[PDB]
Amino acid sequence: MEQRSAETRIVEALLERRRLKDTDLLRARQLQAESGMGLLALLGRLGLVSERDHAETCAEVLGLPLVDARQLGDTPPEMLPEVQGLSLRFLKQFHLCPVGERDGRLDLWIADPYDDYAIDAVRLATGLPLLLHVGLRSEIDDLIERWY
């Protein structure tokens, strides 16, 4: 049956013949991520979908909570050292912010909860399991400047 895209299988053949390295792909993907050419992100940037409809619909489809900026404080809470792993630059680029730990889990406030690239970058850098809370992109961005 269907399993992988044609492009995935071509990249894999190239990797097996060592015409690509694992390292090439981490970099390509990083660049793809920074391009902002995802579908919803681009619709947003064109003015065609409000932050709120984006936020609400994302929450709803993924069965996630939606957190208002008024439900958070004006300084970061105390958090396990390795919210390092997370540069302020990374937070701004992907519009997300760690806002808490209860208990082993890191609460992550995120504008694009469908963005597995960014969520897996945070899982990896942090080594903590995540709990996802959706917010409006601008609210998250203001929080970031405000705390950091």
Side-chain angles (χ1 to χ4, degrees), residues 1-81 85-148:
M1 80 286 142
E2 303 202 303
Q3 218 213 295
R4 310 137 96 198
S5 75
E7 185 160 31
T8 296
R9 290 155 72 227
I10 293 159
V11 166
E12 298 292 337
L14 280 174
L15 273 180
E16 289 167 348
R17 289 141 207 199
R18 318 166 109 265
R19 275 104 223 286
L20 290 176
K21 326 189 198 143
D22 283 333
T23 253
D24 295 331
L25 294 187
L26 293 176
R27 149 109 297 208
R29 283 180 195 132
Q30 166 180 62
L31 292 171
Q32 283 183 310
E34 299 175 351
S35 74
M37 298 307 304
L39 216 210
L40 286 163
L42 173 68
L43 296 157
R45 207 160 57 252
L46 294 168
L48 301 170
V49 192
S50 71
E51 290 189 14
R52 157 240 231 141
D53 287 347
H54 177 205
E56 305 195 336
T57 306
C58 283
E60 174 197 3
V61 167
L62 293 173
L64 291 171
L66 228 195
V67 168
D68 199 285
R70 299 170 270 189
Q71 318 162 27
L72 307 160
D74 314 295
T75 34
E78 291 305 308
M79 292 182 302
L80 275 161
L86 307 183
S87 57
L88 153 68
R89 201 204 177 79
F90 175 84
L91 299 183
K92 289 164 126 87
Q93 176 72 75
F94 293 105
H95 312 299
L96 80 237
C97 197
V99 298
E101 302 192 45
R102 336 144 288 150
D103 356 71
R105 293 249 219 178
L106 193 62
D107 300 303
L108 192 66
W109 205 22
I110 173 159
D112 297 333
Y114 55 84
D115 187 349
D116 54 281
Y117 178 88
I119 284 162
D120 288 346
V122 180
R123 287 221 279 148
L124 180 55
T126 229
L128 301 178
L130 302 185
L131 245 206
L132 264 22
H133 316 278
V134 190
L136 287 225
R137 176 170 335 259
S138 53
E139 294 184 24
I140 286 165
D141 289 353
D142 292 349
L143 196 108
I144 294 173
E145 213 60 48
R146 188 179 237 163
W147 290 3
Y148 301 116

